[PDB]
């Protein structure tokens, strides 16, 4: 009955919580409430440890009570909001934050939380506004500061950049040492100059967040199989992803499940998300030996059960710390061997992950200390892409001569050859080899369709489509879900690129550019006097910010050209218009690397120390283009400048990429799968021999 008794129990539970014994903190809070049920703060505290435990349904009930007892409890509103957000009720979470701010206009956390909703929604300027308000109200606020830092990064606001980075590092350093959870997200940690040890520790601490959520399930260790007898001589591999659908991950690996050899492997795909109806999902479902929809099994215990019950030997985490992940599944440890693969470009930092599948160029042995996992090397690159299957219409090109350039007016199509054979005057320039249509009436009709902005025309009974209009012609083709069934014209004029200039492209999201990268590029642009730099409005608000810094570096406006973000197929195809692609050294083009190389566009890169900054080098090594890999800033600029100034060297390198992209192992998904299969069996033979995981560096 007694408020003082209950107050004491609350203090004793707050003590158990600090000592990390969550278990017992709850039992005490619950007892404080049984003594004095109208105890605002006990309800609030019980609620926020229930939230930690992932018991969201019940956490929310206690927050509601806390608010009922104490209506000015702005802190409780803000946290209730967080709970609603995690429950997918973004609408109602927003109402919590707004309602808190109204009760206490001075309450920083609610502002920061409101900013988070904005950030997630993609409205970045409104996210920035709120983060700044939070920081005005409470100037020492690591969560808000680091989130703001990432917003600013996203739009290329580099105001006080150097001072900002030093502060991030300092904030993280302090949080690690005081054992609180870092405010920098592991998926962002590659963007700031933290130590490698810090990056690993940030990941480690995100891994721990699962532990509390799985401990309340009280599950015993699972008993893993120790031979392949039950599974019929076949090794059972389970791919776990929230991205079996229209998502980069599927655009890279959709072909792999079907290519596993069924004599030795049984493939299980565990989808973490509902069927989005796209062909990517269709294909994996149809080709995996087993497809399991875990989105229907939202309890992590029952899902982990299902994995174990299927008898998986190697469970593959294709998500790391990206949206949709459910690492609780991996923490429950239902498979004897669990490997990170392809999806997340960094270490999990977690004890429940055994291997990271990588390669010698991406993660050389010198830097094995960056990863908590043991390195398991693929023989060439760990990276793969479905471009050979998705976009076969780009395996060959043809050009129109409008005066012999390989990238001014381009034609691709499955039936390109049959069309060209209907034409009278086609020259065949040697290298395969590239056809050149001369300035005819036919050439004139193609270029008039482009100029007048028309959808499509017919020539000799072949359909000729305007490259800018694919989604109107055949939307599934535009997305990469189908191969286009028409001939597609792609021209520089379409995107406002100068007909007679060296074009340097970078199609990544703008967040990957930092002030050094922009400096590097300005340097190249000054030295190659005709060049332009081709960038995307990704996102658009970044554009006026780049243009601004570009001018302080002394480049006129008309030297950097911005295009809108394109549908997948148009995006890949229009790389054919660039001369060279300059890769961001801070965080490489990954999927975007494969995309630009498929078009046969050479890419200059400067491999850093982090995984994310080494991928492009790795892709190029596998292609067999070591001359595009720079050791420093100076060498990067030099390679780029030579490529723009020496037109015979350009022609030569471009031709090398165009050929290598078929003949090397890079885009060869069958060979990749087989290599992955070798590496799986190695991992297994080792575990069956009774060993703990160790480096698989061959």
């Amino acid at each position: 009955s007694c408020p003082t008794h209950a107050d004491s129990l609350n203090n004793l539970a707050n003590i158990k919580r600090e000592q990390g014994n969550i278990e017992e903190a709850v039992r005490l809070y619950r007892k404080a409430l049984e003594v004095f049920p109208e105890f605002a703060a006990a309800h609030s505290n019980l609620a926020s440890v229930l939230q930690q435990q992932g018991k969201l349904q019940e956490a929310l009930m206690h927050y509601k009570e806390a608010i009922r007892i104490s209506p000015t409890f702005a802190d409780a509103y803000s946290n209730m909001g967080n709970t609603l957000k995690e429950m997918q009720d973004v609408q109602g979470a927003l109402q919590c934050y707004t309602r808190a701010i109204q009760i206490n206009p001075a309450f920083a956390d609610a502002h920061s939380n409101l900013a988070s909703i904005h950030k997630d929604s993609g409205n970045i300027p409104e996210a920035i506004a709120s983060y700044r308000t939070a920081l005005k109200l409470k100037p020492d606020f690591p969560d808000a500061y680091c989130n703001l830092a990432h917003c600013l990064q996203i739009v290329c606001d580099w105001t006080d950049y150097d001072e900002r980075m030093k502060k991030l590092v300092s904030i993280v350093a302090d949080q690690l040492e005081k054992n609180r959870l870092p405010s920098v997200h592991p998926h962002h940690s590659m963007l700031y100059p933290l130590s490698h040890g810090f990056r690993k520790a940030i990941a480690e601490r995100h891994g721990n967040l699962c532990l509390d959520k799985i401990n309340v399930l009280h599950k015993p260790p699972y008993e893993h199989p120790k031979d392949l007898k039950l599974s019929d001589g076949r090794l059972r591999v389970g791919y776990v992803s929230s991205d079996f659908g229209n998502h980069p991950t599927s655009h890279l690996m959709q072909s792999i499940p079907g290519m596993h050899n069924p004599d030795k492997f049984e493939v299980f795909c565990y989808a973490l998300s509902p069927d989005d109806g796209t062909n990517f999902r269709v294909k994996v479902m149809a080709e995996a030996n087993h497809f399991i929809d875990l989105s229907q099994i939202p309890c992590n215990g029952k899902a982990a059960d299902r994995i174990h019950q299927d008898g998986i030997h190697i469970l593959v985490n294709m998500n790391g710390y990206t949206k949709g992940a459910r690492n609780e599944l991996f923490a429950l440890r239902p498979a004897p061997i669990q490997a990170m693969w392809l999806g997340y470009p960094g270490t999990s930092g977690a004890l429940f992950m055994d291997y990271i599948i990588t390669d010698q160029e991406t993660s050389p042995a010198e830097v094995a200390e960056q990863y908590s996992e043991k390195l398991a090397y693929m023989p060439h690159t760990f990276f793969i892409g479905d471009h050979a299957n998705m976009f076969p219409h780009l395996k060959k090109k043809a050009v129109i001569d409008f005066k012999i350039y390989d990238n001014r007016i381009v034609l691709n199509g499955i039936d390109l050859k049959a069309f060209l054979d209907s034409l009278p005057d086609v020259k065949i320039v040697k290298m395969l080899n590239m056809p050149v249509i001369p300035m005819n009436t036919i050439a004139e009709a193609v270029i008039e369709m482009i100029n007048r902005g028309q959808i499509q025309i017919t020539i000799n009974g072949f359909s000729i489509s305007n490259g800018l209009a694919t989604t109107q012609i055949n939307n599934k083709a535009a997305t990469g879900e189908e191969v286009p069934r028409t001939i597609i014209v792609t021209t520089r004029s379409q995107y406002g690129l100068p007909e007679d200039a060296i074009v340097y492209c970078n199609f990544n999201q703008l967040y990957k550019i930092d002030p050094s990268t922009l400096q590097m590029w300005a340097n190249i642009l000054k030295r190659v006097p005709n060049s332009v730099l081709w960038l995307l409005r990704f996102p658009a608000v970044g554009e006026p910010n780049i243009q601004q810094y570009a001018q302080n570096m002394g480049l006129p406006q008309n030297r950097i050209i911005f295009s809108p973000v394109a549908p997948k197929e148009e995006h890949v195809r229009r790389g054919q218009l660039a001369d060279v692609c300059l890769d961001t050294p801070l965080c490489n083009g990954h999927t975007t690397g494969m995309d630009v190389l498929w078009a046969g566009t050479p890419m200059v890169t400067m491999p850093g120390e982090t995984l994310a900054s080494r991928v492009a080098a790795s892709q190029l090594t596998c292609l067999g283009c070591l001359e595009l890999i720079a050791k420093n800033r100076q060498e990067y600029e030099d390679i780029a400048v030579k490529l723009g100034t020496d037109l015979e060297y350009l022609k030569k390198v471009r031709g090398k990429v165009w050929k290598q992209r078929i003949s090397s192992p890079l885009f060869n998904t069958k060979q990749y799968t087989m290599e992955l299969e070798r590496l799986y069996l190695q991992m297994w033979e080792h575990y069956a021999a009774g060993n703990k995981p160790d480096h698989m560096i061959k």
Partner: peptide, 7 residues
């Protein structure tokens, strides 16, 4: 949309 990978 054009889907990218996020945190």
């Amino acid at each position: 949309v054009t889907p990218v990978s996020t945190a």
